[model samples]
Target: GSSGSSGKEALEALVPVTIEVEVPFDLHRYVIGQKGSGIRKMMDEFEVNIHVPAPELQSDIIAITGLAANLDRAKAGLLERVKELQAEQEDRALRSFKSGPSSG
Candidate 1:
């Protein structure tokens, strides 16, 4: 039998964690934000990589990579950002519905 190196995985500094959050199409634009400034800040504070696929690519999945703890925190922040964007959408929808000459 050919002796071989054990298959034990290797670990490194930063843990190099990557978590994916499947965001909807509309919200992705905001997730990327103002020429990617949104994700750039998140990357800085969370010390991770937040990847947003290109518009033509038509992808809504975002990936965050770094330490495990940072992944959790970054997840929360991402969720919150999406929530905020959703709220704005709903607010705009309701406002649009609220105004009309028919009510008069």
Candidate 2:
């Protein structure tokens, strides 16, 4: 008889919809505002569970599980940061190459 409130409350806490997204190669971040900052920011913004492999693992599976509505937002935010990181790395490589010794 007294199980009504408890059961209802527990059921209400359950999420109705969720999504999982696996991203491309080495796209996950290590921490917020770092080289892997996209991962960090994504975790902070979404009420979900995100898994990112370590650099040593060399895994490209950036898995995201969360409410369906927030899934798109999370991916978009991550993509933006990843693009920035990719560009920055390319620029750094170009600069380093240019700075190397060149024979006349």
Candidate 3:
């Protein structure tokens, strides 16, 4: 009965924190969008700041900053977007064979 709130304060009172998530370098552009609209949209919706490394830097980890509540959702959304982009590339590659053989 005395072990109720013990060890719970270790991670308590953390209003905001920054986390780094690994995403493919090439796919960064898609998440960032041509005019940065992609990143903006996600930031607005999830209430978090996304900091993607420039391609010139050759990094895969992106920084996500916000309260833990918002950070959790934003990170999930980002990873999901990456998955979608990956699937999109796969579809493009598969469609390339749609031309078929030169008839019989």
Candidate 4:
């Protein structure tokens, strides 16, 4: 029987990389969650570190670092989170209807 090299894949998996991703400043609070718990959970799940720009700076760039694959995975997760937040905001706005009977 022939054997394949698992070492190649393993080596690639551990390669570290950092990326700066853009997210609306307003949504940062939701992504950061209460007392940083949201960011903590994401880091634990993806084994990556994140740097969210402070509100005072009015920046929308979020920096994340991890292995190459994990970096990509984290980016996807952040994108999904942003989309969900936007949807919730839109739905909330859509439901604020104050209608009264039309005058005859």
Clash statistics: count for each candidate = 0, 1, 0, 0
Candidate achieving higher lDDT, 2 or 4: 4
Tell me each candidate's RMSD, in Å, in order: 11.9, 13.9, 8.2, 8.9
Model 3 regions lying over 4 Å from their true place: 1-15, 94-104
Error of 2 at 27 (Å): 5.4
Model 1: per-residue Cα lDDT over 1-104, one tens digit each: 78777545445574587788878878877677777787788789987888877778888788788887787788888888888889888777756655456432
How does residue 37 of candidate 4 score in lDDT?
Answer: 94
Q: Model 1 segments beyond 4 Å from truth?
A: 1-14, 98-104
Q: Candidate 3: global Cα-lDDT?
A: 0.83
Ranking of all candidate structures by their lDDT, best first: 4, 3, 1, 2
For model 1, what is the C-alpha lDDT against the true structure? 0.78
* Number of the predicted model whose lDDT against the real structure is largest: 4
lDDT of 3 by residue, 10-43 (tens): 2455678899898998888877888899899878
Give candidate 2 regions above 4 Å deviation: 1-41, 54-57, 96-104
Question: Against the unseen true structure, what C-alpha lDDT does each candidate score?
Answer: 0.78, 0.58, 0.83, 0.85
